[PDB]
Ligand binder design. Structure first.
Ligand code: HEM
Ligand SMILES: O=C1C(O)=CC(=O)c2c(O)cc(O)cc21
Ligand SMILES: O=C1C(O)=CC(=O)c2c(O)cc(O)cc21
Length: 404
């Protein structure tokens, strides 16, 4: 048999700030280089395997042979200089303990669970849009609505007092502050942990329907520990703001493509399906996030991943799999059943998925039918996008409307 090379060379993935919603050039190359590539990220040390195919991504994220707990030991090559989740956060937990934790709050995040805050959220959103409308056209949609709304929704769901929403925002953005935007990210985390530790123990150690109350109850019943409860609460709190960045890309996109905006304006009933297609297409993050370690040797597409090897999956690349989504780069609100993985896959799939779709749907209705002829106040490429960040998205979204 002819001797051939199955292991591709390590490709350095330097931190680059991509304009708007353009797809990452490097990722594109990795995708065509092969199903299983190897990469080197800005921080950490060494390399890690990278799986970009929709089928292999589902495998690596839904297989017990790959774990999260083992990532804490060494320091896998990564984007952020620090690790976002705490030692016992669900992010770093594996099935046994992980299943126990996710179970404690799953009821609050199902389609039926979030639909309960539907009307209430709609009200909070109308207040924010009403204030933007009252202040006069010239406005930053992100500062006026995209940031405030998601913050208020997750704080109300978590049971965080309105007076502390400002603190939640500051810490979250420092922890996700490109992580390399500084190093107070670690301090930010500590302060967030301390905050939820108090909240979960403070009063919430009784009745309530909010998540910290539910967690307080579970800790009280010895079902989960306080550290587990806190790590999960913090990840949920930071995750809540992901809608700010994502919807920001949604509106920049919509306002950049009149045909897409016109279709949603005239057909409010197709909005749910459209948003889901937008969720598939939108490049939610820079590079990759949290790897998994091979707990034993595993062969993927003719490549042997050795036990101890770190492996990343790219949900963004999986969402562009030509075999799963024909004409991947094309935005088709009709697109067949499109099983996108923007909300992840496997046990760690995003508990906030349904809430994010609910928030995006409420936002689309309000922004399109509540604001008369809203449009970018500047040329599409002039819209600033977060420089140095984990979750891509507008730095600010300058808009104006027919009113004034
Ligand atoms: C369109 C908005 C959102 C997107 C695109 C998104 C995407 C993701 C992705 C890709 C993951 C990683 C899955 C993995 O570990 O393989 C994740 C995890 C997570 N997300 Fe989201 N998310 C969004 C909104 C939210 C919201 C609003 C919340 C809070 C209710 C949230 C809470 C979480 C948590 C707690 C995890 C960690 C789950 C675990 O490790 O068990 N997410 N999300
Ligand atoms: O682990 C990841 C990950 O690998 C990629 C992500 O985008 C992500 C995210 O958006 C939120 C998270 O809580 C975790 C992750
Ligand atoms: O962006 C990342 C990221 O790059 C790595 C993460 O682990 C992570 C996370 O655990 C939770 C988040 O909300 C976001 C991230």
């Amino acid at each position: 048999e002819t001797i051939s090379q199955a292991v591709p060379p390590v490709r350095d993935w330097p931190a680059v700030d991509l304009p708007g919603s353009d797809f990452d050039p490097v990722l594109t190359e990795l995708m065509r280089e092969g199903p299983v590539t190897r990469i080197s990220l800005p921080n950490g040390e060494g390399w890690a395997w990278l799986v970009t195919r929709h089928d292999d991504v589902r495998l690596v994220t839904n297989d017990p042979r790959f774990g999260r707990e083992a990532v804490m030991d060494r320091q896998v090559t990564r984007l952020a200089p620090h690790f976002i989740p705490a030692r016992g956060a669900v992010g770093f937990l594996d099935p046994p303990d992980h299943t126990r934790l996710r179970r404690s709050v799953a009821a609050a995040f199902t389609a039926r669970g979030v639909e309960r805050v539907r009307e209430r959220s709609r009200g909070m959103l109308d207040e924010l849009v009403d204030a933007m409308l009252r202040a006069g056209p010239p406005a930053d949609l992100t500062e006026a609505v995209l940031s405030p709304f998601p913050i208020a929704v997750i704080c109300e769901l978590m049971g965080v007092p309105a007076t502390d929403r400002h603190s939640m925002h500051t810490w979250t953005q420092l922890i996700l502050s490109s992580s390399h935007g500084a190093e107070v990210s670690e301090r930010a985390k500590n302060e967030m942990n301390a905050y939820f530790s108090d909240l979960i123990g403070l009063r919430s150690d009784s009745a309530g329907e909010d998540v910290t109350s539910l967690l307080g109850a579970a800790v009280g019943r010895d079902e989960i520990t306080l550290s587990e409860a806190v790590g999960l609460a913090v990840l949920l709190q930071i995750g809540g703001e992901a809608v700010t960045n994502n919807s920001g890309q949604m509106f920049h996109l919509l306002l950049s493509r009149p045909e897409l905006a016109e279709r949603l304006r005239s057909e409010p009933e197709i909005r749910p399906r459209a948003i889901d297609e937008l969720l598939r297409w939108i490049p939610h993050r820079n590079a990759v996030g949290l790897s998994r370690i091979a707990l034993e040797d595993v062969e993927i597409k003719g490549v042997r991943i050795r036990a101890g090897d770190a492996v990343y999956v790219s949900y963004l690349a999986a969402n562009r799999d030509p075999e799963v989504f024909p004409d991947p780069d094309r935005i088709d609100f009709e697109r067949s059943p499109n099983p996108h993985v923007s909300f992840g896959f496997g046990p760690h799939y995003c508990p906030g998925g349904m809430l994010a779709r609910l928030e995006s749907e409420l936002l689309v209705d309000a922004v399109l039918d509540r604001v008369p002829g809203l449009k970018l106040a500047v040329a599409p490429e002039d819209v600033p996008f977060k420089k140095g960040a984990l979750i891509r998205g507008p730095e600010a979204l300058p808009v104006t409307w027919a009113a004034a």
